[PDB]
From a paper:
AZE synthases catalyse the intramolecular 4-exo-tet cyclisation of S-adenosylmethionine (SAM), yielding a highly strained heterocycle. More recently, AZE synthases have been discovered in bacteria, namely AzeJ and VioH, which are involved in the biosynthesis of azetidomonamides and vioprolides, respectively. Interestingly, they show sequence similarity to the class I methyltransferases (MT1).
Interestingly, the Fo-Fc electron density maps reveal that MTA and AZE are bound to the active site, suggesting that the substrate has been converted via an intramolecular nucleophilic nitrogen attack on the Cγ-carbon. Intriguingly, the structural superposition of AzeJ:SAH with AzeJ:MTA:AZE only shows marginal changes of the four-membered AZE-ring in the active site (rmsd = 0.3 Å, 221 Cα-atoms), except that the nitrogen and Cγ-atoms are moved by 1.5 Å towards each other. This charge distribution is stabilised by cation-π interactions with Phe134, thereby facilitating the subsequent cleavage of the Cγ-S bond, which ultimately forms the neutral molecule MTA. Moreover, the AzeJ:MTA:AZE structure provides insights into how the α-amine of SAM, protonated under physiological conditions (SAM-NH3+), can be deprotonated. Similarly as seen in AzeJ:SAH, the carboxylate of AZE forms three hydrogen bonds with Asn139, Y176 and S203.
Numbering used by the authors:
A (entry chain A): 14 to 245
B (entry chain B): 26 to 246
The structure:
C-alpha cells in the first residue's frame, strides 16, 4: 500500500496545484466547506488531515481556532507546512508528522479531545484495501470527512488529464460498475466511487453517514464512528 | 490568462481557501439568498451557493470560462437558481439587474488589487449588496515571492516589482497592474467607501474581510 507515495517525487507530482485541471477545484472546495461545517456542528477541537501534503486543510483549523495535525510521507511538503505554521504563529495549536497514515491511525496519540479525521482529495481511492484505513478511524476520532472522485464520464476525463499531467508512467484505465480504477507501472493506484458504493463501504466499516454531498466530479461524506461519544 | 490552476504556485491555495470559508459563513449568518461572484472565471464560488441552496450570478469577461460555468450549472441541475453574465464588473455593479433580496458580492483572488481605481468598484457595492467579501494578497515577503512566480507563469512582459509601505505593486510593459494590501490600508480603504468590517482574517499570503454597506438593511429576508 502507498508504494507510489514512497517515491521521492510521488507526492510532489500528485499534489502540485499547477498539475490540477481547473475542474479539481470544485472537489477541493466541497470537501473544505463540509469539513468546516462538520467541525463546528460536531464540536471538534482538533482537525487531523491524513495526506496533508503542505497543509491543504490548515486554513479550516485556523478560522475555527482548532488544533491541527498534518500527517504525510512527503518530508519536503511537511517542511513547507512547518515553516508556514511558525510564520502564522500557530506552533502552539498546529503540528506535523512525517509517517505512514496507518502507523498514525493505529498507534498515534490523540489530537485534542474531539478530533475530526479528514481523508481529502481521493486519499481513500489511493488505498487498494480501504477498509484497513476506515476501520482504524474509530480509535482516535469522533468524526471523519471522506472526499473521493465520482464515476461520472466528466470525473473520469478530469482524472485522465490530471494523472498524465502528473507524469504517472504506464497509466491504464479499468472501468468497473462502481468506479474507474487507474493504475501506473510505478505502483500508482487510484479508484473513484459511485455514491452507493462509497455509502456501502462506510456502513461496512461502522461509519454512520450524517451528511452526503456530490458534485459532477466528487462525493464528500461526513461520518460518525458507531460507539463515538456525540457530546459538546 | 491569470486564472488557470496550471499558472498557480501551491501557496495560492490558502488565499482561495480562507475567502471560500469566509464567503460560506457570511452567506449563512447574514441570511443572503444570492451570491454574486465578480470575476467568477469558471464559477470558483458556485459550490458555496450550491451547498447553501442560494441563488448564484457569475460575472466575468472571459466568455470561455463563462460557457464552462453555464454547462456545469446545467449538469448540476442549478439552471433555475444559477446564472452568468459576460459583462464588465463595474458595468454590472453600476447598471446590472439585482439578484435576490439579500445579495452578497464576492471580490475574489485579489480582484480589488487588480483594479488601479478600486474606490469606483467599492462605492458601486453600496446600493445593490447587503454584504461583501473582499479577498486580497498581503504584503509579507512570502506573498510578494508567490505573486512574482504567479505573474511570471501568467507570461507578464517586463514584470517590475515596486515596494511600498501599504502593499507591493507589480507592473508589466503589456499594461499589467496588481497591488497587494497591508491589513491597515485595506481597512482604511473600505471605511473610506462606507463599508464596515464585521469579520477580518489574515494568513501568510492574504487578507479577507466581510463588510456591510453602512445603511444596508440587516434583516433575515
Ligand atoms: C491527498 S492523497 C495524496 C497525499 O497523501 C499522501 N499520502 C498517500 N498515502 C500516504 C500514506 N500511506 N501515508 C502518508 N501520506 C500518504 C501523499 O504523500 C500526498 O501528499
Ligand atoms: C479574480 S480577478 C480575475 C478574473 O476576473 C476577470 N476580470 C478581470 N477584470 C474584469 C472586468 N473588468 N470585468 C469582468 N471580469 C473581469 C478575469 O477574466 C478573471 O476571470
Ligand atoms: Na478520501
Ligand atoms: Na460543481
Amino acid at each position: 500500500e502507498s508504494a507510489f507515495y514512497e517515491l521521492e517525487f510521488g507526492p510532489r507530482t500528485i499534489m502540485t496545484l499547477a498539475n490540477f485541471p481547473d475542474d479539481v477545484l470544485p472537489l477541493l472546495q466541497m470537501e473544505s466547506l463540509m469539513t468546516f461545517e462538520a467541525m463546528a456542528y460536531l464540536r471538534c477541537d482538533a482537525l487531523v488531515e491524513l495526506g496533508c501534503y503542505d497543509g491543504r486543510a490548515l486554513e479550516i483549523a485556523r478560522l475555527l481556532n482548532a488544533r491541527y495535525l498534518g500527517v504525510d510521507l512527503d518530508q519536503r511538503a511537511i517542511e513547507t507546512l512547518r515553516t508556514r505554521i511558525e510564520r502564522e504563529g500557530m506552533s502552539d495549536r498546529a503540528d506535523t508528522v512525517v509517517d505512514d497514515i496507518l502507523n498514525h491511525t493505529r498507534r498515534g496519540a490523540s489530537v485534542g479531545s474531539r478530533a475530526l479525521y479528514l481523508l481529502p482529495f481521493n486519499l481513500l481511492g489511493n488505498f487498494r484495501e480501504p477498509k484497513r484505513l476506515l476501520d482504524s478511524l474509530a480509535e482516535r476520532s469522533v468524526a471523519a470527512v471522506v472526499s473521493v472522485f465520482g464515476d461520472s464520464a466528466e470525473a473520469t476525463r478530469v482524472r485522465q488529464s490530471y494523472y498524465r499531467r502528473c507524469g504517472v508512467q504506464g497509466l491504464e484505465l479499468h472501468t468497473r460498475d462502481d468506479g474507474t480504477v487507474f493504475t501506473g507501472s510505478d505502483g500508482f493506484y487510484s479508484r473513484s466511487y459511485s455514491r452507493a458504493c462509497l455509502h456501502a463501504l462506510l456502513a461496512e466499516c461502522g461509519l454512520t453517514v450524517v451528511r452526503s454531498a456530490s458534485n459532477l466530479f466528487a462525493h464528500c461524506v461526513t461520518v460518525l464512528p458507531e460507539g463515538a461519544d456525540q457530546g459538546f
